[PDB]
Each structure stands twice: as structure tokens, then as C-alpha cells.
């Protein structure tokens, strides 16, 4: 019939293909360059989703995401290129994670086989944490503040605003938030939540009732951690619905 | 330097590439066939591990794992082929999971985008469970029984033998064990364990002491669930060490 659900195969697709680029030689040979290029070209033919194939092809033939011999120069250039392609897809989907190229380098380099000290167990322990540790998507603080009132009105208790309070103090600056020890907790919390909703078919936007059009309680809890399942357009749309409800409420009482 | 740790990129590699095969048309065109074949041929050039590339190439040029136009006939033939390639690698590593082609079909088909009823949330809920639900490796009951005595002697309490007791009653028949409701629990338990050991650098074989050469307590708990981090050769080796210790003990007392 159709292709496969993007949220099922997507992450494995990225993790594996980013790993492929970090397995590229520091000094490829004309042969290596040709072998990898052809691989990445063929990748565009097999992604199990038509639209995905089209966007990817478009991306690899324009701008800085263009697959060219300069990209294939070395490991740095190849890994930087795929990092950019990944950003290109994120932007297309209007979702952000706030990861710098350096972040991606520190992550995948910890995967590098270090047959020193077969790789030692304490070294792999570190690698595995980096593999299992998921980076949840980010939403700017100015967007989230539009949901605080309704979150309170719907009964979400005080403990759920803790992280938001920390973020406010740091002016919603992600580069600073990422340096906080609690950033690790933020990601683990958001991940369990996102998984909880996915596994229990919990929608992000209220389908019926008075709250129709605004975030569900679980989605609100995610937003309070500057995370969300919604993309930029969907968040702004949710904000507009929340304000329709607040405005109309004010005028009737 | 080297390639990347196989246990970090491997699973994403399989999940994504199996998803690729299920995204293959029911009736490919000469063009499709050529496009996918070239992709899978190039896959062998980019796996971030030299030995892995060699084995894969060897596999796709011999026996039933050979990449040929007959394989590329349709979705059934292509998915059956990659399932066989996966089995080939499992056999090379001497690790088993007991998954039939049908098992793999039921799993990946649940990933198929079903734009009926954008795919509905309750449908995705099912898909996500299949994605997150990991199948832990299996070890035959006759192998495991060699570790029961030492497991008892080392203080492992009774609750850890529960599943083993169920398995004994079913004659260690995996096709029957997989039909049990507790099979789902078995896999979740083994998965957390395997992850716990990986994340905490807990070895599978005692490095020092009197128990040197035999499974560590955590490894023993896994074995009691007919699971293990050890491959066939390593399990038989562990058995031999356990018997050296039992035999020598008997003769000195
Ligand atoms: C080549 C390719 C093309 C795709 N094209 C589409 C498409 O057009 N449409 C569509 O709907 N889906 C597409 N997808 C899937 C989509 O990109 C997501 O993977 C999917 O929506 C799942 O999202 P997620 O939130 O579950 O996790 P993911 O987005 O898969 O994973 C989140 C993780 O991504 C990492 N990350 C984020 N940004 C970067 C970066 N720049 N570099 C490295 N790691 C980063 C973080 O560490 C975070 O933990 C594509 C996937 C691939 C592999
Ligand atoms: C193309 C390729 C070649 C590889 N070659 C090597 C190699 O030569 N040497 C090496 O050390 N590593 C190799 N690896 C990696 C290795 O196969 C494992 O993925 C890795 O050891 C991680 O094992 P794991 O136990 O963490 O999980 P994994 O083995 O990655 O995942 C376990 C999951 O595999 C699924 N599964 C098991 N059998 C099948 C099957 N036949 N069909 C579909 N799903 C199945 C189960 O559902 C189970 O949950 C290769 C990986 C790929 C993608």
C-alpha cells in the first residue's frame, strides 16, 4: 500500500546514516568518495516514504546540502554535510532540537571503536548513555508563556512549572539551559512523556469539549519543559486558539 | 581512527534497512529493481566497520543471501532476502533471537502508513509498541540448566527462577514459550537487564576471584530467562568453566 510511518523508521534512519558518515576515512580515495557518494545518492531512492524521497533529493541538489565532491573531501566535510541535511529536514518539518555540529560530533565520536586500554566496558558505558539519551525538541520560552495561564486554569499542579521557572531566570537561553545539570533531567522527562503519549494514543490537541483546539494536559506538561510534539505552525495555531478562548472568556464575564 | 562500535549503530542499521525493504513496491519496475539493488550493493561499502563490510559482501554473493534479480522481484522476495541476510549475520556472531520470517512481517507491516479511519493514533500506538518492544536473544534450556546450581550457590533468590520453571514445563520449546503471555514480560525484563549492564559497564564473565570464568550474577539472572549477552561459543565456554569448578570442588570435599 503506502510507505512506512515516518516516526517509526526515521530515528533509526538518522542514527545509522550519521554513524555511516563518522565511519568515513580521514583521507578518502577517489574510490571511497565515489563509493559513499553513490550510497548517499541511492539513499534518496529507498527512504520508505515518497515525500521524504522528494525532499531529500531536492536538498542534496541545492544550497549547502548539495551532495558534491567538496563534501566528500574528508570525514569532517562529510559529517558536517549530513548534519546540515538533517537540519534541512528538521526545518522542513518545522521542528528544532538546538543541536550544534559540535554536539553531534561529541556524540558520534564517543561511538568510535577504541580497541585500547575490543573496546573497554567503561568506555562503552559512556557510548551507550549517549545512544539511549534522546534530545527532545525545543520550543522558545516566549511561545510557551502563552500556555501558562491555561495550564494553571486546567489544574496542572505547581511541580510541573519548576523547569519553566528555571528557564525564565535564564531568559529562555538554550545555550545556557543546556549547560545546566537539570538539562539531562528535562530530556529524560520529555522523552518518557512523548513515548507515553505515543504508546497510549494521547493526542496533542483537544479534539472535543470546551478546550477544543488547545493543548491536551500531557502536551501542556511537555510545553512547560520547553518541549512539544507540535511544530512551529502548530504551536502558533495552538496559541491563537488559546487566546480566542481567553479573549471570549474575558468579554462574557 | 577505527570504525564505530557495532552494538551502538547495529540496531538502527537493521531497523532502518528492514523498513527500506518493506517500502519496496509490490510490482517494482526495471528501474526500481536497479535503484534498490544498487542501494543494497552500496550499503556494503559504508557500514562503519571493516569486518562487517567484508562479511556482508561475502553474504550477498553466495547462497540464499546472494543479491540477485530474483530477490528484487517484489516486496515479498526483497523482505525475505534481507531477513535472511540478518539471520546470516546472527549466525556469524553465533547469537539467536528465534524470529521467523512471519514474525518480522507482522512487525514491519504494522509500520505501514495507513492513511485511513495521516495514520490514526490508536493504529500508531500499536506500531510504537512493536518498535519499542525489543526481542532479547535466546539460549536453549539444556545450556541454561548447567548454570542453575551455581546460580543457587551464589545466592540468587527463588523469584529469579520463576520463568525458568515455566520453561522447564514447556520443555524449553520457544515456539510455545512465545505464545505465552509472560513472553512479553521475559523480553522486557531481559532488555532492561542488558541495558543496565551496558550502561554500568557490568561484565558478563567474572574477571577475578574464585568465580573467574563463570557468569557474573547479572549474567546468571539473564540466563535464567533463557537470555544472555554471550554467543554460543562463549556459553559453552562458560559451561566448561562452571564444570571445572564443580568437579574440582567435589573432589576436594
Ligand atoms: C534521510 C531522511 C529523510 C527524512 N525526510 C522526512 C520528510 O521529508 N518528512 C517526514 O515527515 N519525515 C522525514 N524523515 C523522518 C524525520 O526526520 C524524523 O526522524 C521523524 O519525524 C521522527 O522524529 P522523532 O521526533 O521521533 O525523532 P528523530 O527526529 O528521528 O530523532 C531525534 C533525535 O535527533 C537528533 N538530532 C536532531 N537534529 C540533529 C542533527 N541536525 N544532527 C544529528 N542528530 C540531530 C537528536 O539527538 C534527537 O535525539 C526523514 C528521515 C531520514 C533519515
Ligand atoms: C547490514 C549489517 C551488517 C552487520 N554485520 C556485523 C558483523 O559482521 N559483525 C558485528 O559484530 N556486527 C555486525 N552488525 C551488527 C550486529 O548485527 C548487531 O546489530 C549488533 O551486534 C547489536 O546487537 P544487539 O543485540 O544490541 O541488537 P540487534 O541485534 O541490533 O537488535 C536485536 C533485534 O533484532 C531483531 N531481529 C533479530 N533477528 C532478526 C531477523 N532475522 N530479522 C529482523 N529482525 C531480527 C529482533 O527483533 C531484536 O529485537 C551488522 C549490522 C548491520 C545492519
Numbering used by the authors:
A (entry chain A), B (entry chain A): 32 to 148, 157 to 292
Per the authors:
Mimivirus R596 is an enzyme of the Erv family of sulfhydryl oxidases, which catalyze the formation of disulfide bonds using an active-site di-cysteine motif juxtaposed to a flavin adenine dinucleotide (FAD) cofactor. Here we present the structure of the intact mimivirus sulfhydryl oxidase R596, including both its sulfhydryl oxidase domain and its ORFan domain.
Mimivirus R596-4C was crystallized in space group P6122 with one protomer in the asymmetric unit. Diffraction data were collected to 2.21 Å resolution. The R596-4C structure is highly helical and has a two-domain architecture. Rather than clustering spatially with the carboxy-terminal helices of R596, helix α6 packs against helix α5 from its own chain and helix α1 from the Erv domain of the other protomer (α1’). The tightly intertwined R596-4C dimer has a larger buried surface area (1150 Å2) than the R596Erv dimer alone (680 Å2). The R596-4C ORFan domain (R596-4CORFan, residues 180–292) is composed of six helices, α7 through α12. A structure similarity search found no close match for R596-4CORFan, suggesting that it represents a new fold. In contrast, residues 229 and 266, which are cysteines in wild-type R596 but alanines in R596-4C, are buried in the R596-4CORFan core and likely form a disulfide bond in the wild-type protein. In the R596-4C structure, these cysteines, Cys146 and Cys156, appear to be within 10 Å of the FAD-proximal cysteine pair, Cys 80 and Cys83, from the symmetry-related subunit (left). Notably, the lack of clear electron density seen for Cys146, Cys156, and the intervening loop in the R596-4C crystal structure (right) implies that the loop may be sufficiently mobile to approach the FAD-proximal cysteines.
